[PDB]
RNA sequence: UUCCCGGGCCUUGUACAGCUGUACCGGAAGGUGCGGCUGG
RNA sequence: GUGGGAGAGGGUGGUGGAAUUCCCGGAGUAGCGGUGAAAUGCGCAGAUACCGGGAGGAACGCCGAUGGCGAAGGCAGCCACCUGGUCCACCCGUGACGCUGAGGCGCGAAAGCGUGGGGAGCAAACCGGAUCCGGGUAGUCCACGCCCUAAACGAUGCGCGCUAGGUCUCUGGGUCUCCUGGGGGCCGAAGCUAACGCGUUAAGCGCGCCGCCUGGGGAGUACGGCCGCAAGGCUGAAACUCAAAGGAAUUGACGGGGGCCCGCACAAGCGGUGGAGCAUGUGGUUUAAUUCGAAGCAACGCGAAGAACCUUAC
């Protein structure tokens, strides 16, 4: 876009929980436009969380969400045909975007046979602070704040 | 080996190279550093990275002699002045005063062809 | 603010009254431009000469060292 | 184009004569040259430009191609290799100006049994023109290129042939290698050194040049002045007045003193 | 909107940095030193 | 004439430091130095970065300005002496004593020469490297003699009188927010100009005197003369050749180089292609024929929205 600000689409909150984060999550799980299958996967996963872990899985999901939420990002810059991975602030929207994206890819990355168990294990572990998504977040953070000398490139 | 524990640092930051040297209050140097001792050769010696390195190299060979407090006096108009400054500032040392001491001519000797055409 | 306004009555040609002359010097031993000093053309010109005289006598610095970043 | 006809006319090339070409390039020169000489041999260096040359010269058979520079090659080797029955040899090189200046001399100090050269130079440096002593054009280079040969510019050329558009005018100069040195020489080295000593500062007087530029000199003020006295050369005369015979005599004088 | 590609509109040089006095060029489709000018 | 003013105007005699280089000591040492990149080069008799003490040369950083002075070229550290020009106030004195100026005489950036000194830095020519960098003689500096050129330009000769104003600035004087002189710029009446533009600092209206032009090239060339030690300078043609050579300004073009804005152009994402098998089109080979066309985007599941016979053109 060159003129507009590309207004953010307001997602319809989920039915059972009345929450928008759950809707966003199930949307991110989606492949080939199969909503029902993704919702079933999520519901099975949360039921597994409930059986295994005493408390309501809604809170554990949210806690994992702000657990795997970063603050710094490195972006490329093209000055004199050279790369400048300048660190930069992330808006809450962007924060949420990468958080959900990492969560879903990490869920798909597990070696467990079933998708539901994979996503459940990733969710619980990310809540704890271990797993692929978390390790990737500290990866990007340590990639950031290590080239603070480049901070003058405000961009 | 000197145990002066308090000296002054001099930074010659040129276009092509940056050299840092630590000395006693008297003015007898104890150690230096240069892009060259790091291992960089050619253009990259002038590049501030080599400054980021010889920066602390000074400091290290200085902790080696047990110096704590430092006075920083910088010379030249090199690209890697300020980053070298922040460097030997946070190399683990208490900097007292930092001053720019770039020596300018009082319209004396005629420079190179590259440095003429000044109006 | 301009230096000239925030002063009292004084002499320009007096090359010995150091504590007024220094206030016409920067942190480095340089004569301020007309903008900073707010002096007329003739008084600036005579002030330059007085500065040079007192400066040769050793009362004023040829240069000073700015203490900053 | 078509300047080639007039240059060849000033080459006085015959059927009995052979020709060496140093900068043939596209072979346009060689093209119009072929119809006049029995033997044409071309030195060539550009690996890029050679393949395009090879096929284009197919119509004419009397051509020969040599793939090394004039600098690091024995010209006499080639002359003996190909020119066994040929009477004399001409050279019609038209190569870039900044390359031509050393090679022409190099062909000269080696004293190959070649008669003369017809070559393109800049107008201003036409072997420094006629090298008449009392002139701006007169030089050390002139002294070199009349000590070994007789040179004259047959004509000049404005406009362009090869390049889109130049800035300066050009000329063509014609040469004959002389049988012997102009005047007797006690040493080549000393003679050439004396030439450079005289021409080191053109504007300064000859006496000053000899005293300063020449080694020692300061200790031999009286000696130099005396010898130039017996030489019948005035001290305040400049280098640009002395001629070949003069310099010879002066060189003879300076040695043995 | 920095960059890659492709367009539109508005601005400047040559076609339907340059010049110049002088002094030199044995790697002269010109080069350099000392100045000077905008007729950039 | 009296009373005052400003100023890199000039000449002479001296001293103030910043910086570069070299030398003598201290301490320290694996490289300094350079380009878009690199390479020559300096260093174990220990370089650069550093501190202290000396030597010598040249120039004068901020002030410094679009500013000032001079007839031009030109002139900036500071002090002292000698000296030129100029401006204003008083309206005191002489009573036209004025303007211009062929020749002459003097001055004349830089570069260059001679007789002697000096030489830090920079640098023609020259010595080396990859094909701009490192050194380096003359020179740049001083004294005395020559040389006398230029985009020596405001491309505008000098003096005087008249012809609306506005604004900025330098320097004087008054009855002080203004009035009245002398300089330096910018917009503009009338007017002038081919136009650009000029416009009380005229390129307007006029008068006086001097210099210069008679189409381009040849050519500031040839011969002669004068000057100079020399390079060269001043004066300055013809034969021959062309029908143009030029000055402004308009429209447009190509890349000069910038400004701005748009496009799933980039970026931020999702899914693909290039790896595999198969279908189709095409290049090239092969064949008796493999009919023919389409060729960057904008040809290549295109003509062909149906080739076993027809279609079919081989």
UniProtKB/Swiss-Prot annotation, chain A:
| Gene assigned in the entry | rpsG
- What highest taxon heads this organism's lineage? Bacteria
Its function? Answer: One of the primary rRNA binding proteins, it binds directly to 3'-end of the 16S rRNA where it nucleates assembly of the head domain of the 30S subunit. Is located at the subunit interface close to the decoding center. Binds mRNA and the E site tRNA blocking its exit path in the ribosome. This blockage implies that this section of the ribosome must be able to move to release the deacetylated tRNA.
GO annotation, cellular component aspect? small ribosomal subunit
Q: What is this protein called?
A: Small ribosomal subunit protein uS7
Which is one GO molecular function term here? structural constituent of ribosome
What InterPro entries does the record tag this protein with? Ribosomal_uS7 (IPR000235), Ribosomal_uS7_bac/org-type (IPR005717), Ribosomal_uS7_CS (IPR020606), Ribosomal_uS7_dom (IPR023798), Ribosomal_uS7_dom_sf (IPR036823)
Assigned keywords, A-Z = Ribonucleoprotein, Ribosomal protein, RNA-binding, rRNA-binding, tRNA-binding
Matching Pfam families: Ribosomal_S7
Q: Report whether Ion transport shows up as a keyword of the record.
A: no
For this chain's UniProt record, which GO biological process terms are given?
translation
| UniProt-listed Gene3D superfamilies | Ribosomal protein S7 domain (1.10.455.10)
Q: How does it assemble?
A: Part of the 30S ribosomal subunit. Contacts proteins S9 and S11. Binds to the C-terminus of IF3 and to the C-terminus of Era.
Family under the similarity heading: Belongs to the universal ribosomal protein uS7 family.
What NCBIfam families does the entry give? rpsG_bact
UniProtKB/Swiss-Prot annotation, chain B:
Bias type Basic residues, positions: 109-119
Under Pfam families, the record lists: Ribosomal_S11
UniProt GO cellular component terms: ribonucleoprotein complex; ribosome
Question: Which residue spans traverse the membrane?
Answer: none
Which superkingdom? Bacteria
Which molecular function GO terms apply here?
rRNA binding; structural constituent of ribosome
Q: Which UniProt keyword terms apply here? A: Ribonucleoprotein, Ribosomal protein, RNA-binding, rRNA-binding
One GO biological-process annotation of the entry reads:
translation
Disordered: annotated span: 99-119
Q: What does this protein do?
A: Located on the upper part of the platform of the 30S subunit, where it bridges several disparate RNA helices of the 16S rRNA. Forms part of the Shine-Dalgarno cleft in the 70S ribosome, where it interacts both with the Shine-Dalgarno helix and mRNA.
Quaternary structure and partners:
Part of the 30S ribosomal subunit. Interacts with proteins S7 and S18. Binds to the C-terminus of IF-3; however exactly how IF-3 interacts with the 30S subunit is unclear. May contact the C-terminus of Era.
Please give the family membership noted in the entry.
Belongs to the universal ribosomal protein uS11 family.
Q: What is this protein called?
A: Small ribosomal subunit protein uS11
Curated annotation (Swiss-Prot), chain C:
* A biological process term (GO) from this entry: translation
Q: Which domain of life is it from?
A: Bacteria
Gene symbol here is: rpsR
Family to which this protein belongs: Belongs to the bacterial ribosomal protein bS18 family.
Q: Name one GO molecular function term.
A: structural constituent of ribosome
Question: What does the UniProt record say this protein does?
Answer: Located on the back of the platform of the 30S subunit where it stabilizes the close packing of several RNA helices of the 16S rRNA. Forms part of the Shine-Dalgarno cleft in the 70S ribosome, where it probably interacts with the Shine-Dalgarno helix.
Its taxonomic path starts at: Bacteria, Thermotogati, Deinococcota, Deinococci, Thermales
Report disulfide bridges, numbered on this chain: none
What quaternary structure, including any partners, is listed in this protein's UniProt entry? Part of the 30S ribosomal subunit. Forms a tight heterodimer with protein bS6, also interacts with protein uS11. Binds to the C-terminus of IF3 and to the central section of Era.
Q: What is this protein called?
A: Small ribosomal subunit protein bS18
Q: Which organism is it from?
A: Thermus thermophilus (strain ATCC 27634 / DSM 579 / HB8)
GO CC terms in record: ribonucleoprotein complex; ribosome
Name the coiled-coil region(s). none
Q: Which keywords belong to this entry? A: Ribonucleoprotein, Ribosomal protein, RNA-binding, rRNA-binding
Swiss-Prot record, chain D:
Instruction: Give the PROSITE patterns listed for this entry.
Output: RRNA_A_DIMETH, SAM_RNA_A_N6_MT
- List locations, semicolon-separated: Cytoplasm
- What happens in the null mutant? No visible phenotype. Not essential.
Q: What is the catalytic activity of this protein?
A: adenosine(1518)/adenosine(1519) in 16S rRNA + 4 S-adenosyl-L-methionine = N(6)-dimethyladenosine(1518)/N(6)-dimethyladenosine(1519) in 16S rRNA + 4 S-adenosyl-L-homocysteine + 4 H(+)
Q: Name one GO biological process term.
A: rRNA methylation
Any one cellular-component term (Gene Ontology): cytosol
* Single GO MF annotation: rRNA (adenine-N6,N6-)-dimethyltransferase activity
* Gene3D superfamilies tied to this protein: Ribosomal RNA adenine dimethylase-like, domain 2, Vaccinia Virus protein VP39
Pfam families per record? RrnaAD (PF00398)
Q: What residues bind S-adenosyl-L-methionine, as annotated?
A: 23, 44, 69, 94
**Enzyme Commission identifier(s):** 2.1.1.182
InterPro entries recorded:
KsgA/Erm, rRNA_Ade_diMease-like_C, rRNA_Ade_Mease_Trfase_CS, rRNA_Ade_methylase_Trfase_N, rRNA_adenine_dimethylase, SAM-dependent_MTases_sf
Q: Supply the alphabetized keyword list.
A: Cytoplasm, Methyltransferase, RNA-binding, rRNA processing, S-adenosyl-L-methionine, Transferase
What is the documented function of this protein? Answer: Specifically dimethylates two adjacent adenosines (A1518 and A1519) in the loop of a conserved hairpin near the 3'-end of 16S rRNA in the 30S particle. May play a critical role in biogenesis of 30S subunits.
Quote the HAMAP family the UniProt record gives: 16SrRNA_methyltr_A
The record's annotation in NCBIfam families points to: ksgA
Q: Record's family?
A: Belongs to the class I-like SAM-binding methyltransferase superfamily. rRNA adenine N(6)-methyltransferase family. RsmA subfamily.
Under what name is this protein listed?
Answer: Ribosomal RNA small subunit methyltransferase A
Question: What species does this protein belong to?
Answer: Bacillus subtilis (strain 168)
């Amino acid at each position: 876009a060159r003129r507009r600000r590309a207004e953010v689409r307001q997602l319809q909150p989920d039915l059972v929980y009345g929450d928008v984060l759950v809707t966003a999550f199930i949307n991110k799980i989606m492949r080939d436009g199969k909503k029902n299958l993704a919702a079933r996967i999520f519901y099975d996963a949360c039921k597994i969380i409930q059986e295994k872990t005493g408390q309501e899985p809604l809170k554990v999901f949210k806690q994992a969400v702000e657990n795997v939420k970063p603050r710094m990002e490195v972006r490329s810059r093209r000055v004199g045909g050279a790369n400048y991975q300048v660190p930069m602030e992330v808006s809450p929207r962007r924060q949420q975007s990468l958080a959900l994206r990492w969560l879903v890819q990490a869920a798909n990355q597990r070696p467990e046979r079933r998708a539901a168990v994979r996503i459940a294990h990733e969710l619980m572990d990310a809540a704890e602070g271990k797993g692929g998504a978390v390790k990737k977040k500290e990866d990007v953070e340590r990639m950031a704040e290590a080239n603070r000398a480049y901070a003058h490139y405000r961009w | 080996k000197r145990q002066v524990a308090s000296g002054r640092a001099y930074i010659h930051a040129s276009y092509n190279n940056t050299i840092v040297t630590i000395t006693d209050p008297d003015g007898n140097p104890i150690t230096w550093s240069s892009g060259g001792v790091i291992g960089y050769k050619g253009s990259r010696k002038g590049t501030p990275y080599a400054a980021q390195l010889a920066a602390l190299d000074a400091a290290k060979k200085a902790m080696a002699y047990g110096m704590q407090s430092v006075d920083v006096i910088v010379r030249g108009t090199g690209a890697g002045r300020e980053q070298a400054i922040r460097a030997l500032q946070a190399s683990g040392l208490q900097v007292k005063s930092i001053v720019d001491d770039t020596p300018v001519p009082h319209n004396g000797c005629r420079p190179k062809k590259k440095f003429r055409k000044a109006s | 603010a301009k230096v000239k306004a925030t002063l009292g009555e004084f002499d320009l040609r007096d090359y010995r009254n150091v504590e007024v002359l220094k206030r016409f010097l920067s942190e480095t031993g340089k004569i301020l431009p007309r903008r900073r000093t707010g002096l007329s053309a003739k008084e600036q010109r005579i002030l330059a000469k007085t500065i040079k005289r007192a400066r040769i006598l050793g009362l004023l610095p040829f240069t000073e060292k700015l203490v900053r970043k | 184009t078509n300047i080639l006809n007039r240059i060849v006319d000033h080459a006085e090339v015959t059927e009995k004569t052979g020709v060496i070409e140093i900068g043939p390039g596209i072979g346009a020169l060689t093209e119009q040259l072929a119809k006049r000489a029995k033997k044409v041999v071309a030195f060539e260096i550009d690996q890029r430009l050679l393949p395009i040359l090879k096929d284009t010269l197919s119509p004419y058979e009397n051509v020969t191609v040599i793939h090394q520079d004039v600098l690091k090659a024995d010209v006499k080797s080639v002359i003996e290799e190909q020119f066994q029955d040929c009477d004399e040899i001409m050279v019609v090189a038209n190569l870039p100006y900044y390359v031509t200046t050393p090679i022409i001399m190099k062909l000269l100090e080696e004293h190959l049994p070649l008669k003369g050269i017809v070559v393109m130079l800049q107008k201003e440096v036409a072997e420094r023109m006629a090298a008449d002593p009392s002139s701006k054009e007169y030089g050390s280079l002139s002294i070199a290129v009349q000590f070994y040969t007789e040179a004259k510019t047959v004509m000049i050329v404005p406009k362009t042939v090869f390049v889109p558009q130049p800035n300066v005018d050009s000329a063509v100069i014609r040469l004959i290698l002389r049988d012997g040195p102009a005047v007797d020489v006690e040493n080549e080295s000393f003679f050439f050194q004396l030439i450079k000593a005289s021409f080191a500062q053109r504007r300064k007087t000859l006496l000053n040049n000899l005293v300063n530029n020449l080694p020692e000199g300061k200790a031999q003020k009286s000696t130099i002045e005396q010898v130039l006295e017996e030489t019948n050369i005035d001290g305040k005369r400049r280098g640009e007045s002395l001629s070949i015979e003069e310099f010879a005599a002066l060189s003879n004088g300076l040695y043995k003193a």
